[PDB]
Amino acid sequence: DVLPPEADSSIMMLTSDQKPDVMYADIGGMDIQKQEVREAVELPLTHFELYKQIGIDPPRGVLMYGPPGCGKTMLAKAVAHHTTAAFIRVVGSEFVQKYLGEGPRMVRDVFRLAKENAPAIIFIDEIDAIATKRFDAQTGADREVQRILLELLNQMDGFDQNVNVKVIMATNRADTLDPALLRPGRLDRKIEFPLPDRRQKRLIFSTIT
């Protein structure tokens, strides 16, 4: 038998009641970051033909990095709240499982479910859990995580320009990331979320107060 593509997926999409209550207006002073995410995640999802006519190759993935507390995860909450596309939320630590092969398996269910429910956004918070540049071949942890990362690279390589799936990865330790994850075609857009400037500070102060 052949099962439906949306079937056999331990990872589920975001339901309407799981949508975070965080708005874009809730976030204060991240116009550069908001613009880049919009131009690289939500605008290609709705304007894929305008990219093709102009000639821009839309970034398959987006890496959001910066010091902790600078709006990485929250922007994903706002994107998930303000999107008409499917949102598949995950954190890299869940991929590491006791049952060997279940990690690489549940990586391809995320991408298979996203492909079947296109347009879709894959958000993988704390990507350092499965994207560390060091691997010990005599340890089952690093052997399995190597399989998870290799599948993750294979899945993004397996997406052509026709499939309308965007991947978002967030990390505050991008120095520890494997350079293969940042290659073109996998994460072509690295957005930095730095510490707020003085102008950024007054917008964050105004939005919370």
Next chain:
Amino acid sequence: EQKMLLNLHKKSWMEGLTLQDYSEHCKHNESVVKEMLELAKNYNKAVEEEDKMTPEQLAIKNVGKQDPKRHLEEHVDVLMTSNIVQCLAAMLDTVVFKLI
């Protein structure tokens, strides 16, 4: 007992003369004919591709990729069954249910 079991899934006599909704019948005809429009475009590509294909790829290369010829036949079979029945049932009803 065999004739009694033959009554399973035996539709009522009303259904035989019942005409399908014409708005949906045209819409179904509309959609499927449009579906064959893309399939015919893909069917041309399959003819040229299979001309230059090794005999080991006659089936392996057809695995996982949709066959325009196969879906064209299914669409043709569905439409011709749908329209002939709708036409025949309509023609029968014009004389059977006649006011004169």
Next chain:
Amino acid sequence: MQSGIIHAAEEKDWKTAYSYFYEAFEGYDSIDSPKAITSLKYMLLCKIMLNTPEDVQALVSGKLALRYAGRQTEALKCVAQASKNRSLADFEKALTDYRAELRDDPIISTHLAKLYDNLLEQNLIRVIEPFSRVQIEHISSLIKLSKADVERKLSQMILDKKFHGILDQGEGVLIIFDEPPVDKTYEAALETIQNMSKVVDSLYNKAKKLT
């Protein structure tokens, strides 16, 4: 602010002009500038020339735009009412009650002529909507325009396919027609035949070369 003005002065798409006025408004709003009303004016005007005058009410009702609720916003809000009602008479009354806020602004005054032509089509559609065969003199009475002007416009609209009808010069009547939409089944059938013909072409090369 100047980016939108040049975008509108060149008669390009008004979506880009609206966007530039939107960001100009927010920046003027953030610094509490006296020019925020001028940007708020041109935002609504862009919505009017985009043939979406209903959004003008929603814009002024926003929290940032309530601070500027005054005569200048009233000028465009009533012009939006006029376009929304598809009333040409309301437009002239709008240009009379708020002549200073509309006819004296160099940016809006330039696009007033285009608004008049745009509203002339819509009002004509509204006037002729309930009719299948109506006197041209009766249409002119409702629109309060000359018979020749309305007849010329109606003939031009028929050419532009804005509405389906014909003009009877002898009786001076407009005959409106309820055309049927084209049968897309025949459209798809015709291109299927064209694409099926290419298959026959392809099967020909296979037929002659392999036998």
Next chain:
Amino acid sequence: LLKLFTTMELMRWSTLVEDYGMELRKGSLESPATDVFGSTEEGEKRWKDLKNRVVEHNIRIMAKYYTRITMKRMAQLLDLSVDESEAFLSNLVVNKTIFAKVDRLAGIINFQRPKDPNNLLNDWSQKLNSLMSLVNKTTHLIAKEEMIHN
């Protein structure tokens, strides 16, 4: 009065004023009148709106029963002038409240939409479905009478 707006029939505005005008506007000492249709500006505006509701109700009834009517007849039935009735009818057509195509040369208002071949055959099909159900129901009714009178 509330029933008169429920009956699927024409009601005449002249009849309403002569039958309910005094009770609604001025009222009686035994049954005082409410401020809906008083002498005030609000009461006068609501009185005009009541006439619209009567006129609107009549056009709704005229659309159900008439297939083609004359503007001269519609104006008479609406207690309106031909210009007012046409202007009132033109308003409802614009806001999609009631379908009507007005042929002003011949003075004809057409309340029937063009017949889509789908709709014409669907109505024919629906008649057959009701007919076959009725034939089914009649046969069962016959079986009961065979049981009782045998």
Next chain:
Amino acid sequence: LAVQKVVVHPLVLLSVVDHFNRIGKVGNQKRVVGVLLGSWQKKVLDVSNSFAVPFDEDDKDDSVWFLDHDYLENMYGMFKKVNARERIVGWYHTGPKLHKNDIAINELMKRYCPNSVLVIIDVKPKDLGLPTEAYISVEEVHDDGTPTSKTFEHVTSEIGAEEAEEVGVEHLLRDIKDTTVGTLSQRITNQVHGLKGLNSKLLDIRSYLEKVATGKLPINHQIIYQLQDVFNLLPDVSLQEFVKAFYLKTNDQMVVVYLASLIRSVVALHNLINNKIANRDAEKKE
């Protein structure tokens, strides 16, 4: 009403036939009465099992009849233990038509199921109709003034099966059933059966009108009322508007058949090309 449709499963039909063949043995050939078991899903009944009950009646007098209702309760509890989700939904009897005393029997069965559904299951293999006729008791309020009486109202009946039920039925009908016939042939056979069913029902109404005409049966004035509605619903296919629309519709379907037939010929020629290429290639190497 309270019942929209009754789905009678093939097990009940076999059980009812077996009930008739084992009671209607050398003893007699009357009607046999049992108790129907099934579930309720929205407003469609799901008659799925039955058990026989002892029953007898007088051939002459209709008020004399016996049903072992204590036997009913004892076996219901016996069946409830095996399958608790299957409650009493009514009774059945193999009588070819209704009887005068069914309304009394339904009252006895109404205690065990308030919305009891009587299903007449004809053991004889009728050629055109389903063997099941599902009835429910209703209180007919006459407008002539005659006092309100209990009557049976017809409920549309269908024979459907469970997944394992249909597996066994297809095993028993493996040889007899001919599944080689394509869908289009089956649909036309449905139309022929629809014509036959309508003719039989039209003949039944005509036979009833013949009895009324000669005075054998009284004038009902509810059937006649319904009959005028039937003849009024008879469409006029001679109207100009209808004929043009029919031609407009028929031609709309014909072009789709023409397109599908046109595609079929091309695909058929493609198959012929491949066959000749395969035949030529096979003989070249041999």
Next chain:
Amino acid sequence: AEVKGVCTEAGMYALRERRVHVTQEDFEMAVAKVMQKD
């Protein structure tokens, strides 16, 4: 690489205006963003 990034940014600027064809303005505005801002 900076030259290439200017081109890809010039195409972005046309998209910000919902244009299809990249204009000379876009290349100049891309040059300023890539070099001077960054």
Next chain:
Amino acid sequence: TRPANHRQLTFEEIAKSAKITVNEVELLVMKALSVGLVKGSIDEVDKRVHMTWVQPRVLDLQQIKGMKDRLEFWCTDVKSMEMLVEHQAHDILT
């Protein structure tokens, strides 16, 4: 009384048969249509009422005989095509 082919009554016939003025014919049909006694539509421009249904009434034995005579013709037509489809589609009939 009129057959279903000729159920288009003029205003004059309604006015003459019901002893009412032609101008009161329209209101008369409204009461009939609103109550539900009859079904149809009124063509005021052509002074004609298109009647599609009447409340079924009590029939004598003679009219019932006539109703059955219509069934005999109707039965023959159904049987005629039942044999027509069977004969024409005999090869493909299951």
Next chain:
Amino acid sequence: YLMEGSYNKVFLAKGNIPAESYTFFIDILLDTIRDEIAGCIEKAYEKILFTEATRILFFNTPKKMTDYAKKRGWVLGPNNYYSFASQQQKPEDTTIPSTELAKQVIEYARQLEMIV
């Protein structure tokens, strides 16, 4: 001339015959032409005047119309006009040929299923 309808030249063919032997067969033809000309008129003219058809039918004496009129059954009008209202007998599109269409559609189903 007979095929294209030049009925004027058919009657003019009498004068310019090539030889005296051809006379007999010409009259035999001319009797057929007379019915053929009037056969057009019923379907061509919706009304034609009395002496208007004299040259059309190539009749010499008006009396020769009277006997031919009743033979053809032409209802003469009070205004010396023949009323030819006979186009009402249209091809009769009022009736759908259901049996013929049902016969054809069944044959399509036969050519799809009977093949095996």
Next chain:
Amino acid sequence: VAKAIRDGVIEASINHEKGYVQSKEMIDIYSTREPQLAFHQRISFCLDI
């Protein structure tokens, strides 16, 4: 012209007194059986192939 309207070549009528020929208004071809007849000979030929 007289035969052409008799043979069905053209649908028209002649006004002898006035001296003109009035062509009949064209009937909707797609509202009659001719499209079915044209399709039938095309459908049956495809089914024959």
Next chain:
Amino acid sequence: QAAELFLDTVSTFTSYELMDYKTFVTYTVYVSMIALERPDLREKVIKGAEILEVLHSLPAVRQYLFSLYECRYSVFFQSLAVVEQEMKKDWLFAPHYRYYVREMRIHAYSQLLESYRSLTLGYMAEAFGVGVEFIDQELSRFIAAGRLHCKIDKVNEIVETNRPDSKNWQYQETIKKGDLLLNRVQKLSRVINM
């Protein structure tokens, strides 16, 4: 297809090895008038910023384009005659110079008749600067071809327009193109058997 492809590249034209840009815009206007509807013509050609700039240096082509759009039929015929001679001497348009002019004449006649229920022969002759006999012969040729939805009442010299449905035109093409396809299918089976 030529109009669609040319209009896409009117603002991206760099194929100077094939033609000059002025000549390219000249061809773009020519194919647009014969292949584009009136709403499509005004958005792309009449209001085209790139085309209008070139039309400043090409007064003849601009006159030809705007004469039809502005309903100046007398000038349009004069411009169409000028365009005809250009395309006869042009190696690309030479095989289609007769067809293009005929179709453009059909466009002008149809455009004038589209908005009116009946137009007299003299008015149409006056509009095009031609005689009544010319307009009568041209119409009778085009109506017989089925390309003009009108009929002439020659006794009163009145041209009355018709509104035939799109279903009829589609049906003839389906009969036409289907018969063309069927001829290939019949011919291919002949090759297969022998």
